[PDB]
Design a protein around this ligand. Structure first.
Ligand SMILES: [Ca+2]
Ligand SMILES: [Ca+2]
Ligand SMILES: [Ca+2]
Ligand SMILES: [Ca+2]
Ligand SMILES: [Ca+2]
Ligand SMILES: [Ca+2]
Ligand SMILES: [Ca+2]
Ligand SMILES: [Ca+2]
Ligand SMILES: [Ca+2]
Lengths: 64, 74, 66, 278, 63
């Protein structure tokens, strides 16, 4: 029967789609955590930029 | 009349639907592979982001020490 | 009826098109994540060089008040 | 020695049936007792799993004459997807009936409009390695300075049926083995009722880079049974005494530091794996 | 049923379509944040190199 092969294909497709749902969910969670992590890294980047710029400013001023 | 053409139209459309389901299977399999590779890449980039954040921390500590030394020179 | 089999065929093709949109969406996902991986590699390079330069400057400033 | 087989083939379009002719086989090896063999021919269609036909038994003849005809109830539209298989077997009273030689004709090359009849030299039948057990994909990441080994159990597919009347209840247990002693036993969650389980579960171990070439990682896929000991589906091992794709993945993990490598692996039977584990 | 398998599979498919769309947009935002962090990283290592030069000057001067 060809309808049987069709329905079997439908079932396999359904299960694989569910697996893709789990993958999409875990993917999304990891993406969110990495976005927060990027925010922290950028905050530290601005702080270290401030410290380096100020230290180089005073260091250049102390020339003499 | 068009009776034979009607039956062959039913079998033909059924064939197109079946091959459509085959295309579905191939597409969801490729999507599956690309998704897995995407997850692994996200793991690599994630650990890299962790070591980058720890690097920023070490830069912050060292630069704080250099700030202290500059305040000692001042 | 040809109406029944034809409507079933139409719904099947609709499911195929939805799975095509999801498919291209997954491929776009992998591509964007790849390019982001390259940019992350470059960021890691710049951060490492910043670690080296910061370490040198800290060493010198520590050795200057000695 | 490659023998010959004389076969007929014709299609009945009125009743939509396949007429297969077994005429005679020629130049048969002197198997069975000394001098002469005992041949019987089993005929069956390749895609279908229908009941296989077998000819009469001919006692002590190297050139047997069957002159038998079989009918296969097959639609002509589906016959494009089928292939005819004719296998010449040998008869043994007290031993396993060894197959002498088989051959197959793809139905897409047969012109059933004109009556077909051909001589075909037999070929030695191909053999399967083992029943399909399954594959499992996971990634390996190693950083020497910290000694952390991240094994991310990704997924598996095409797992063998275990519970009777059902598909499977798979879960993954990884054993860190060394010197024939089990050291760390980690396991994943149970994904109930599936043949393509998905995990995406990260695990970690302590592996110094001074012992990296003396540790074994045993990835074991098992099936959960609600009552009784959970039977094991399959298992693979990477590290020392690893062969082929396993040593390939381990070498990729070593050549790629601070980076994960995702890879598939073909499960082997628990007995032969435990045998390969010295 | 036969139509119910199609309806279930279709519902799951459209669901993963929505989820994956949200994820793809999240990866767009991630791409912006990674470009910004890239610029900040390059400028940061440049300024760190300059501070290394000035630190070398002050070391060779006051020591
Ligand atoms: Ca594939
Ligand atoms: Ca992380
Ligand atoms: Ca962190
Ligand atoms: Ca024999
Ligand atoms: Ca005998
Ligand atoms: Ca079982
Ligand atoms: Ca079970
Ligand atoms: Ca944003
Ligand atoms: Ca932003």
């Amino acid at each position: 029967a060809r309808e049987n092969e069709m329905d079997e294909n439908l079932e396999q497709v359904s299960g694989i789609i569910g697996n893709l749902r789990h993958m999409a969910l875990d993917m999304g969670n990891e993406i969110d955590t990495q976005n927060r992590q990027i925010d922290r890294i950028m905050e530290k980047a601005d702080s270290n930029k401030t410290r380096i710029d100020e230290a180089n400013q005073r260091a250049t001023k102390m020339l003499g | 009349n068009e009776l034979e053409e009607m039956q062959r139209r039913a079998d033909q459309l059924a064939d197109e639907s079946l091959e459509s389901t085959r295309r579905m299977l191939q597409l969801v399999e490729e999507s599956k592979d690309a998704g897995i590779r995407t997850l692994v890449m996200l793991d690599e980039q994630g650990e890299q982001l962790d070591r980058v954040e720890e690097g920023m921390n070490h830069i912050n500590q060292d630069m704080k020490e250099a700030e202290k030394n500059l305040k000692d020179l001042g | 009826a040809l109406s029944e089999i034809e409507t079933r065929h139409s719904e099947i093709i609709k499911l195929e098109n939805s799975i095509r949109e999801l498919h291209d969406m997954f491929m776009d996902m992998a591509m964007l994540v790849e390019s982001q991986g390259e940019m992350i590699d470059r960021i890691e390079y710049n951060v490492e060089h910043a670690v080296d330069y910061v370490e040198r400057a800290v060493s010198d400033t520590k050795k200057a008040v000695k | 020695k490659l023998g010959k087989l004389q076969y007929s083939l014709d299609y009945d379009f009125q009743n939509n049936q396949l007429l297969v002719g077994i005429i005679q086989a020629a130049e048969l090896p002197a198997l069975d007792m000394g001098g002469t063999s005992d041949p019987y021919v089993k005929v069956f269609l390749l895609p279908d799993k229908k009941k296989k036909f077998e000819t009469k038994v001919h006692r002590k003849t190297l050139n047997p004459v069957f002159n038998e005809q079989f009918t296969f109830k097959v639609p002509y539209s589906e016959l494009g997807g089928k292939t005819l298989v004719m296998a010449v077997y040998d008869f043994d009273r007290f031993s396993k009936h060894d197959i002498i030689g088989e051959f197959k004709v793809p139905m897409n090359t047969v012109d059933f409009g004109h009556v077909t009849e051909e001589w075909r030299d037999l070929q030695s039948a191909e053999k399967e390695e083992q029943e399909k057990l399954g594959d499992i994909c996971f990634s390996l990441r190693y950083v020497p300075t910290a000694g952390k080994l991240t094994v991310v159990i990704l997924e598996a597919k095409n797992l063998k049926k275990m519970d009777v009347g059902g598909l499977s209840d798979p879960y993954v247990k990884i054993h860190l083995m060394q010197n024939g002693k089990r050291l760390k036993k980690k396991k994943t969650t149970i994904k109930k009722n599936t043949l393509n389980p998905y995990y995406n579960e990260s695990f970690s171990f302590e592996v110094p880079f001074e012992q990296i070439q003396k540790v074994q990682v045993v990835v074991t896929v098992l099936d959960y049974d609600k009552i009784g000991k959970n039977d094991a589906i399959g298992k693979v091992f990477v590290g020392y005494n690893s062969t082929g794709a396993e040593l390939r993945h381990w070498s990729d993990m070593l050549a790629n530091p601070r980076r994960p490598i995702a890879q598939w692996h073909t499960l082997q039977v628990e007995e032969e794996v435990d045998a390969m584990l010295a | 049923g036969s139509n119910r398998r199609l309806q279930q599979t279709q519902a799951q498919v459209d669901e993963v379509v929505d989820i994956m769309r949200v994820n793809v947009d999240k990866v767009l935002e991630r791409d912006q944040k990674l470009s910004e962090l890239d610029d900040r990283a390059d400028a940061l290592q440049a300024g760190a190199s300059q501070f290394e030069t000035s630190a070398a000057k002050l070391k060779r001067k006051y020591w």
